[PDB]
Amino acid sequence: MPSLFDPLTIGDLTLANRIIMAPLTRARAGDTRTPNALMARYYAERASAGLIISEATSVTPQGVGYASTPGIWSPEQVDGWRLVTDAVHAAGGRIFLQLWHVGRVSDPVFLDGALPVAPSAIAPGGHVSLVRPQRPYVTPRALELDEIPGVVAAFRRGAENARAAGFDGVEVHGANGYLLDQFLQDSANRRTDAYGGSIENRARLLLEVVDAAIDVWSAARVGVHLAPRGDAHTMGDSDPAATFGHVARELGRRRIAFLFARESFGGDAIGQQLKAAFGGPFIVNENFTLDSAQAALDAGQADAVAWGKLFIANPDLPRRFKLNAPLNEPNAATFYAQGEVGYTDYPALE
Numbered sequence: 001m002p003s004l005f006d007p008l009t010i011g012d013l014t015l016a017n018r019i020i021m022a023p024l025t026r027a028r029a030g031d032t033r034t035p036n037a038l039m040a041r042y043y044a045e046r047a048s049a050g051l052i053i054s055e056a057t058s059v060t061p062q063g064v065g066y067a068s069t070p071g072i073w074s075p076e077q078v079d080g081w082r083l084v085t086d087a088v089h090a091a092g093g094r095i096f097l098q099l100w101h102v103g104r105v106s107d108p109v110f111l112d113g114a115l116p117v118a119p120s121a122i123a124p125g126g127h128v129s130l131v132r133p134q135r136p137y138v139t140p141r142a143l144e145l146d147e148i149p150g151v152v153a154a155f156r157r158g159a160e161n162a163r164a165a166g167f168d169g170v171e172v173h174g175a176n177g178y179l180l181d182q183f184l185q186d187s188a189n190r191r192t193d194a195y196g197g198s199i200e201n202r203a204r205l206l207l208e209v210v211d212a213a214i215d216v217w218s219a220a221r222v223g224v225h226l227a228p229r230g231d232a233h234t235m236g237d238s239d240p241a242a243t244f245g246h247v248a249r250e251l252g253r254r255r256i257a258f259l260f261a262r263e264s265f266g267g268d269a270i271g272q273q274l275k276a277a278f279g280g281p282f283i284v285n286e287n288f289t290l291d292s293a294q295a296a297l298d299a300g301q302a303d304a305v306a307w308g309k310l311f312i313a314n315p316d317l318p319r320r321f322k323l324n325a326p327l328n329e330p331n332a333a334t335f336y337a338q339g340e341v342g343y344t345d346y347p348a349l350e
C-alpha cells in the first residue's frame with residue numbers, strides 16, 4: 001500500500017508525491033483573460049504538489065462563462081501560460097491544463113449577446129454564478145449536428161496551445177455540468193441524433209474530445225475529470241453507474257494518464273466501480289482529510305488524492321501534512337475576487 005508521500009507515475013511522467021492540487025477557478029486573469037505574473041507566483045508556490053491541475057481554461061469564446069477566467073485559444077494567452085509553466089517547473093512542479101467549455105452554464109453577457117450552447121435547449125436551474133444582478137440562466141441554443149466537429153476542433157487547438165505553452169499535459173473537463181458533462185447525462189442531453197439517446201451516443205463527444213487530446217499529447221499525458229453524483233449545475237442521470245462505467249471502461253481502454261473523480265466518499269459513491277472499470281491511476285477528491293486520504297490509498301480505493309479548498313489556503317499543504325502542522329482556513333470571500341489578496345497572501349509555514 002502506498003503513502004501519500006510516495007512517488008506516483010502517470011503515463012510516463014513521475015510525480016514527487018500523491019498530493020494533487022485540484023483545478024480551482026480563481027478569476028485572476030483580468031479583463032484580457034491572459035495568465036500573468038501573479039498567477040505564475042500563485043502556482044509556483046504550490047509546486048510541491050505532486051501535480052497541479054490548473055483552473056478551468058476555456059478553449060473558445062463560446063465556452064466562456066465567468067469574468068476574468070483565462071482562455072487557451074489565443075497566442076497572447078499561450079505566452080501568458082508560458083509564464084505559469086516556466087515558474088512552476090523552476091520550482092519543481094508538474095502542471096496540467098484543464099480544457100474547458102461551459103456549454104449552457106453561461107450568459108449572453110459573456111458571449112456578446114449570443115445564447116450559450118448545449119446538447120439540448122434546456123436551461124440549468126438557479127442563477128448565474130457571480131454576475132450581479134442575479135438572473136436565471138437563459139434557455140440555451142442546441143448545437144446543430146454539423147457544429148459538433150467545431151467544438152472538438154476547439155478542444156484540439158486548446159490541446160495544441162497547451163503543448164506550445166509548455167504544460168506537462170492536459171485534463172479534459174468532463175465534470176460539474178459543463179459542456180461535455182451536459183452531453184453525457186440524460187437530464188441535460190435529450191438529443192435524438194448520434195450524440196444523444198444511448199449511453200454510447202451521450203459519451204460520444206467526451207470521447208471524441210479525449211481522442212483529439214490524445215492525437216496532440218498521446219494518452220500518457222491526458223487526464224479526464226468526472227463528477228459522478230451529478231450534484232452541480234442541474235446534472236443528473238437515470239443510471240450513473242451505467243453511464244460513468246461505460247465512460248470509465250472506454251477511457252481505460254485508451255490507457256490515459258489518470259481519471260480524476262470529484263465525489264466525496266460515502267454510501268452512494270460509485271468511485272470504486274469507476275476505478276475497476278478504468279484500471280489506471282485514479283485520483284479521488286472532495287471533503288478529504290489527510291487521514292481519510294491515506295485510508296483511501298491503504299484500502300486500494302485511490303492512487304492519489306486531490307484537495308481544492310485547502311490548497312487555496314495552504315500553498316505548502318504537503319509539508320503541512322508531513323509535519324501535522326495547523327492548516328490555514330480558506331476565506332470564501334476572496335475565492336473569486338481580484339488581485340493578490342486571498343490569492344498569494346496565504347502564508348507558508350517557513
Ligand SMILES: Cc1cc2nc3c(=O)[nH]c(=O)nc-3n(C[C@H](O)[C@H](O)[C@H](O)COP(=O)(O)O)c2cc1C
Pocket residue numbers: 022023024025026054055056098173175176225262285286287288306307308309310335336
Ligand atoms: C473556488 C473554487 C473553484 C473551483 N474551480 C474548479 C474548476 O475550475 N474546475 C474544476 O474541475 N473544479 C473546480 N472546483 C472544484 C474543485 O476542483 C474540487 O473538486 C472541489 O472544491 C472539492 O474538493 P475539496 O473538497 O478538496 O475542496 C472549484 C472549487 C472551488 C471551491
